[PDB]
Subunit: 146 residues, 3 copies
């Protein structure tokens, strides 16, 4: 069990090996590899099992877009960086509803995001992991200029 992380997959392996297995079996591990990378871990098991349900269905389309909505190609370590033209691999721009010192609430789903207390990246490696305690990440909306 690692305490520092050179890649997000090592963190996800210690928390949810099943979800990491789905990311690999969907050919999406490259989206998790660092432009920075910020992963949104859905804490609620109902969300993750809905991902597993769709991923192991005859059409994993919804599991793909949902996992795309949880992976941002940007390095966002603190609430201060949750600003500007940023978003997930779906392309939908994220809009902040409320900001705090260690918490962020987004619009278009009301997703409450708190930085992972145990995730800490290697020196100068631009990786970040947030915990989605409630709500859902946006799926459709205005795009961010990439």
């Amino acid at each position: 069990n690692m305490k520092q992380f050179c890649k997000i997959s090592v963190w996800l392996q210690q928390h949810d090996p099943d979800l990491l297995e789905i990311i690999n079996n969907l050919c999406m591990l490259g989206n998790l590899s660092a432009h920075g990378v910020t992963f949104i871990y859905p804490k609620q098991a109902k969300i993750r099992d809905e991902i597993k349900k769709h991923a192991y269905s005859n059409d994993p389309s919804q599991a793909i877009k949902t996992l795309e909505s949880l992976i941002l190609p940007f390095y966002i370590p603190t609430p201060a960086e949750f600003t500007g033209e940023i978003g997930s691999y779906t392309g939908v721009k994220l809009e902040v509803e409320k900001t705090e010192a260690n918490k962020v609430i987004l619009k278009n789903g009301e997703a409450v995001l708190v930085p992972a207390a145990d995730f800490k990246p290697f020196p100068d490696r631009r990786l970040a992991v947030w915990i989605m305690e409630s709500g859902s990440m946006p799926l459709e909306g205005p795009p961010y200029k990439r």
Copy 2:
């Protein structure tokens, strides 16, 4: 565990059906041959073909297992019996000659390879991947090469 119904790469299908064979392909540094010109994989159903792959791989000279696995991987997208035509072949370079064609079966010369499309291999719509089941015979190893 992994129970994908659609496949973004052939290794996912192999991991669920034959994980030991996938480990052999990885241990022989041949996973790149399986990845996307489009790729068609021929899965060996019979024991004596698969056992010789395992034995040759874990022997002092794994070259024979490498050549056999090269015969089972075609750098072409061949989903149906109709596509088994023209200058196509495996990584051995040998051109495939069709003996008899059916709606859902192909028999090849130079080994009597009886090939049936794997029904449970359904690739992603944007992936030029195909998996066939060799029910008997052997894929061509040596023969006239196909024009590159």
Copy 3:
């Protein structure tokens, strides 16, 4: 078991899966892949004990630097090639104290290196594995210049 190897990782997967997992968890698997590559497996347990301890600590800096000293970006199959401007990923130049037909003893730690009896590379692959029966690989010193 494999008798011939296309990459060092397959050999380490058979002899020490724990050490391979550490290398992957430190994002150092690429250091072992081929210019040639020479891996030095520490036979003594406590050297591998300390690698694991520093790896899963709060700061894996030492486990990283230790593994860097065990991986050489050069193809050294026999004692005859243990000469010239050679060294590990730490950059420190290796100086040979004693050379034999099937053994090589280094300065700056008295590392006794014998080629692995069961590692035979693929014909066109420049990979070699040595067993460090005693001593330590150099950590600091004058660098060879690439």
